[PDB]
Swiss-Prot record, chain A:
It is found in: Plastid, Chloroplast. Component of the chloroplast small ribosomal subunit (SSU). Mature 70S chloroplast ribosomes of higher plants consist of a small (30S) and a large (50S) subunit. The 30S small subunit contains 1 molecule of ribosomal RNA (16S rRNA) and 24 different proteins. The 50S large subunit contains 3 rRNA molecules (23S, 5S and 4.5S rRNA) and 33 different proteins. The keyword GTP-binding does not apply. The lineage of its organism: Eukaryota, Viridiplantae, Streptophyta, Embryophyta, Tracheophyta. InterPro entries: Ribosomal_uS8, Ribosomal_uS8_CS, Ribosomal_uS8_sf. PANTHER family: 40S RIBOSOMAL PROTEIN S15A. The gene is rps8. This is Small ribosomal subunit protein uS8c. Keywords: Chloroplast, Plastid, Ribonucleoprotein, Ribosomal protein, RNA-binding, rRNA-binding. GO terms for molecular function: rRNA binding; structural constituent of ribosome. It comes from the Eukaryota. The keyword Nucleus does not apply. Signal peptide: none annotated. GO terms for cellular component: chloroplast; ribonucleoprotein complex; ribosome.
From Swiss-Prot, chain B:
Keywords: Chloroplast, Plastid, Ribonucleoprotein, Ribosomal protein. GO terms for cellular component: chloroplast; ribonucleoprotein complex; ribosome. The keyword Chloroplast applies. GO terms for biological process: translation. Component of the chloroplast small ribosomal subunit (SSU). Mature 70S chloroplast ribosomes of higher plants consist of a small (30S) and a large (50S) subunit. The 30S small subunit contains 1 molecule of ribosomal RNA (16S rRNA) and 24 different proteins. The 50S large subunit contains 3 rRNA molecules (23S, 5S and 4.5S rRNA) and 33 different proteins. It comes from the Eukaryota. This is Small ribosomal subunit protein uS15c. It comes from Spinacia oleracea. The chain holds residues 16 to 90 of 90 of the full protein.
Curated annotation (Swiss-Prot), chain C:
The gene is rps5. One of its GO terms (biological process) is translation. It is found in: Plastid, Chloroplast. Its main location: plastid. This is Small ribosomal subunit protein uS5c. Component of the chloroplast ribosome (chloro-ribosome), a dedicated translation machinery responsible for the synthesis of chloroplast genome-encoded proteins, including proteins of the transcription and translation machinery and components of the photosynthetic apparatus. GO terms for cellular component: chloroplast; mitochondrial small ribosomal subunit. The keyword Plastid applies. The lineage of its organism: Eukaryota, Viridiplantae, Streptophyta, Embryophyta, Tracheophyta. Keywords: Antibiotic resistance, Chloroplast, Plastid, Ribonucleoprotein, Ribosomal protein, RNA-binding, rRNA-binding, Transit peptide. It comes from the Eukaryota. Residues 1-61 form the S5 DRBM domain. GO terms for molecular function: mRNA binding; rRNA binding; structural constituent of ribosome. It comes from Spinacia oleracea. Component of the chloroplast small ribosomal subunit (SSU). Mature 70S chloroplast ribosomes of higher plants consist of a small (30S) and a large (50S) subunit. The 30S small subunit contains 1 molecule of ribosomal RNA (16S rRNA) and 24 different proteins. The 50S large subunit contains 3 rRNA molecules (23S, 5S and 4.5S rRNA) and 33 different proteins. uS5c binds directly to 16S ribosomal RNA. Belongs to the universal ribosomal protein uS5 family.
Length: 133, 75, 154
RNA sequence: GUUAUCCGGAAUGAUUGGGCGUAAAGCGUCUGUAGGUGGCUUUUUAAGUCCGCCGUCAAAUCCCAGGGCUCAACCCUGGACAGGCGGUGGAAACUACCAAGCUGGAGUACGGUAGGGGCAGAGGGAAUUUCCGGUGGAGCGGUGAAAUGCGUAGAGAUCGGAAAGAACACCAACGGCGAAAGCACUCUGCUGGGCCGACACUGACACUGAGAGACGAAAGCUAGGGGAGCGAAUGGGAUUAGAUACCCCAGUAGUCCUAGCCGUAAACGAUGGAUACUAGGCGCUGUGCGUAUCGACCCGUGCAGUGUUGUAGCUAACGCGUUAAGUAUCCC
């Protein structure tokens, strides 16, 4: 667990590729905020919190199989960017946009976490956490 | 009894099991299996000490003067 | 459109038993394309089987009002890797052999493409197809995400 | 047009943009110093980071907008994105710092239990060889077939004695421990790890590792012992055109022990390490729980490791598939 963000991302990517709607992830300010945002973009069905032995778990419901499990036209991609090895930042005029804007880019900035959309409205740059397709 | 998990107690238990192991390592010199363990445990103790030096300078110096532990290699 | 003609060989106690492989792609030039491969003794019959096979394998390429791709995409088949990205109208289709004939036969007017990795004509054709198959069009990402078009445009 | 030079194409030195099971490629294996990265919560600070404003980064060139040589090249005017450095004003999410906290990571104690882990010291029996006898009296031994060889100075065979060294039948198993090399007749002693169950405790003490250190099959070497069997070298006998080989008969180093050196192997899973996460089926080893009886099963299960098929996914194919060669992060 050297990187927590990357790990959440991964648990999703994996549970996704295996055609399961339900994922357990471990919560954190970052985790929680990212998932909130994921919901308001609409990449994921529903979130909720659980607690046991002072451990928090966000379970994520995921978008249902595409008109069967065998015939899938679409998957749901995720990619880590700024990672412990190399941290990537961008000013306002380099803010990434994904597939012409079909996908979303998550940014940690001075005003908190957001998408690239928010960053453009408010005129802010910052650290690029990940991309989502 | 005291703290059995405390830094200083652990470092003690280690220093002690090591000086104990020393006699066996002297009598049977061909036992490498055991020596490998010695080197491991000494490693542990050395780690804890480095940690403790980071966290509390005073408790550290007190400890290595107390248990007669050789002075650290950061000098 | 015959992309490639090769003479593959089976070997028998007699000698070399020669066949022709044909790699052929079909399109309407209107946004419908497919690939097919065939084998026979004569150029002609191979070509034909190639046609017939492609016609039963065929798919559709998502197009934009200017005749290009919705978005940037990669693709992978075997050692063939393929990179397509949309272009401004008036740049035409710039690419290499498999990728370019498939693209062009689909009716894509403006596209950037490059095949990285291998050069096999065939796997590059298939790869191109997997690329343009996974192309999502905006109406559909707006339908998936459950968000109005004008919101994603921004 | 040809030659020379440079960049391209070349993803062919790869940040964007590759690889290391079999294609070139994972140190033989660990321990560990610098170095890099490192869980969660609150606060602080503001070094990175971000936003605004100012100074400057000469003119020419490149880029945009006009104008002049009849056009163009070329010249002239005006202006600017990048990107850099420096000052100042703000933001505080993330990295970093500062203060206090938290256990699920890492450890410590406690109690269990399995084991060819290792070193040392005792003890054991088969079998083989030689020697000393008794019997017996012509061949033994060996090969594809022979011969060298051993034997009337009594061989082999068989019984009875001693003596010596080395290796440990059955158990043994697609089983056990070990970091790897390897470790098995038995036993005792000194000791290294492992794993499991309990909150008992500390509270990030972590992971990796350039240099460096320790261990490291066999052959080999130095010194002293020891010397049955086997057996390089060597010799004889064959076979063969030849036979410096294969086969046979002998047989020295060496194999063994003590104290060292050497540091190489297809040292192989041809697979560096740690962490997280992703179907099953059938098996085994250790323990724990509930059930079964109240002690052996039995069942279902929790872990820890170990084996065989196989889904997703991966791959050039073969195949790999929770013990990944899958999906990601960090170091070498
Ligand atoms: Mg910058
Ligand atoms: Mg590939
Ligand atoms: Mg190419
Ligand atoms: Mg290059
Ligand atoms: Mg790279
Ligand atoms: Mg390569
Ligand atoms: Mg080879
Ligand atoms: Mg190789
Ligand atoms: Mg290895
Ligand atoms: Mg080495
Ligand atoms: Mg280490
Ligand atoms: Mg360190
Ligand atoms: Mg740190
Ligand atoms: Mg953190
Ligand atoms: Mg200038
Ligand atoms: Mg002009
Ligand atoms: Mg003019
Ligand atoms: Mg000018
Ligand atoms: Mg500037
Ligand atoms: Mg500045
Ligand atoms: Mg803060
Ligand atoms: Mg702290
Ligand atoms: Mg005996
Ligand atoms: Mg006799
Ligand atoms: Mg093991
Ligand atoms: Mg023990
Ligand atoms: Mg405390
Ligand atoms: Mg090294
Ligand atoms: Mg040595
Ligand atoms: Mg040896
Ligand atoms: Mg010699
Ligand atoms: Mg012999
Ligand atoms: Mg000879
Ligand atoms: Mg002999
Ligand atoms: Mg020796
Ligand atoms: Mg080597
Ligand atoms: Mg190797
Ligand atoms: Mg049973
Ligand atoms: Mg397991
Ligand atoms: Mg296998
Ligand atoms: Mg398998
Ligand atoms: Mg591979």
């Amino acid at each position: 667990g050297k990187d927590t963000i990357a790990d959440i991302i991964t648990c999703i990517r994996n549970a996704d590729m295996n055609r399961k709607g339900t994922v357990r992830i471990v919560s954190t300010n970052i985790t929680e905020n990212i998932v909130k945002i994921l919901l308001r973009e609409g990449f994921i069905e529903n979130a909720r919190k659980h607690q046991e032995r002072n451990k928090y778990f966000l379970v994520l419901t995921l978008r249902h199989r595409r008109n069967k499990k065998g015939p899938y036209l679409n998957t749901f991609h995720l990619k880590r960017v700024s990672r412990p090895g190399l941290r990537i930042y961008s000013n306002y005029q380099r803010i990434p946009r994904i597939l012409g804007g079909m996908g979303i880019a998550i940014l940690s900035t001075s005003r908190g976490i957001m998408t690239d959309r928010e960053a453009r409205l408010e005129g802010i740059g910052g650290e690029i956490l990940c991309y989502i397709w | 009894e005291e703290n059995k998990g405390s830094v200083e107690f652990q470092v003690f238990c280690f220093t002690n099991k090591i000086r104990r192991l020393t006699l066996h390592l002297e009598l049977h010199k061909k036992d490498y299996s055991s020596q490998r363990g010695l080197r491991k445990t000494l490693g542990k103790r050395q780690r804890l000490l480095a940690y403790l030096l980071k966290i509390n300078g005073v408790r550290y110096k007190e400890l290595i003067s107390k248990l007669n532990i050789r002075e650290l290699k950061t000098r | 459109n015959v992309v490639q003609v090769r003479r593959v060989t089976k070997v028998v106690k007699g000698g070399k038993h020669m066949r022709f492989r044909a790699i052929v792609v079909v399109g309407d030039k209107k946004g419908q394309v497919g690939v097919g491969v065939g084998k026979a003794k004569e150029v002609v019959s191979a070509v034909q089987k190639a046609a017939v096979d492609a016609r039963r394998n065929i798919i559709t390429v998502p197009m934009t009002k200017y005749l290009t791709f919705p978005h940037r995409n990669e693709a992978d088949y075997g050692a063939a890797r393929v990179m397509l990205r949309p272009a401004a109208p008036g740049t035409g289709v710039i690419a290499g052999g498999a990728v370019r004939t498939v693209l062009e036969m689909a009716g894509v007017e403006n596209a950037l493409g490059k095949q990285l990795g291998s050069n096999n004509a065939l796997n590059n054709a298939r790869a191109t197809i997997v690329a343009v198959q996974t192309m999502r069009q905006f109406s559909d990402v707006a339908r998936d995400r459950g968000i109005p078009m004008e919101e994603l445009w921004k």
